[PDB]
Design a protein around this ligand. Structure first.
Ligand SMILES: *[P@@](=O)(CCCCC/C=C\C/C=C\C/C=C\CCCCC)OC
Length: 275
């Protein structure tokens, strides 16, 4: 459903995803690349702990994953001022969640830290694998081509349009803003009822989200423990390279998308409740 690929750019960053009321510290869930928390609805409805989502709105600083993570920590502190924190992220959000817990590690130091980090099918290197495959198609150092490729991909998620006619429409344009405007007009032609400003924000932010992920490396190894629940990047999605604590891995049924529903979901729920 296409509006699941959209965010209200003026919506709240932190959102309560279930109605559990207790003194148990909440679980905070970080969005996948599209920025919305829709993918977490089934999980949140089932969890017995208060559950919040983080969505990516116009207010989010996207200059780096470092900045995005710091902003999300500021947001979480409006409901839970002190740790320890329970944070999970899915896909693109796994890298953000990793960086959030890394910043929490470094902030609560030198005191021993006890945060819980769950990565649902992602890691600091997970997005990079995707971006490199597309970079392979492009003239080195040509920003215009990278913008074009990203925005073309975006259009193809919202329309049945053929790749080359969209690429060719976007390539010669003046800059990102013109590419975004062209993309939104193409999507609106197909889907007249979608919101123009939601689409514009989604398109622009898609490019900046990808740039931030491409440029990201952790500042230091994470010393806390990590639970990877996953569907080359290898068995642990390269986490041993950036973690000096325990990296526990469990393989969940489904693909990169269905793991948060059906069978995968039952496993995730069980592991959250135990660990
Ligand atoms: P997850 O959040 C998926 C995480 C990976 C998302 C990236 C997937 C595809 C990238 C598509 C196009 C990028 C093309 C341009 C290459 C240059 C990069 C631009 C900065 O699950 C939803």
């Amino acid at each position: 459903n296409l509006r699941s690929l959209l965010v209200n750019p003026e919506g709240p960053t932190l959102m309560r995803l279930n109605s559990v009321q207790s003194s148990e510290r909440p679980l905070f869930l970080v969005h996948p690349i599209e920025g919305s928390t829709t993918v977490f609805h089934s999980l949140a409805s089932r969890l017995s702990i208060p559950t919040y989502g983080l969505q990516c709105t116009r207010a989010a600083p996207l200059d780096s994953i470092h900045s995005l993570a710091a902003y999300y920590i500021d947001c979480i502190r409006q409901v839970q001022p002190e740790g320890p924190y329970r944070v999970a992220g899915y896909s693109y959000g796994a890298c953000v969640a990793f960086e959030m817990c890394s910043q929490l590690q470094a902030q609560q130091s030198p005191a021993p830290t006890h945060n819980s980090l769950f990565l649902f099918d992602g890691s600091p290197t997970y997005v990079l694998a995707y971006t490199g495959s597309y970079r392979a198609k492009l003239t080195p150092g040509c920003e215009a081509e990278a913008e074009t490729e990203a925005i073309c991909f975006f259009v193809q998620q919202f329309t049945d349009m053929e790749h080359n006619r969209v690429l060719e429409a976007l390539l010669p344009l003046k800059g990102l803003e013109e590419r975004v405007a062209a993309a939104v007009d193409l999507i609106i032609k197909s889907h007249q009822g979608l919101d123009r400003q939601e689409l514009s924000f989604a398109a622009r932010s898609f490019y900046y989200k990808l740039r931030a992920a491409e440029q990201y490396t952790p500042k230091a190894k994470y010393h806390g423990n990590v639970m990877l629940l996953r569907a080359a990047a290898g068995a642990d999605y390269n986490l041993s390279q950036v973690c000096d604590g325990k990296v526990s891995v469990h393989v969940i049924e489904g693909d990169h998308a269905t793991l948060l529903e059906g069978s995968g979901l039952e496993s995730i729920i069980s592991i959250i409740h135990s660990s």
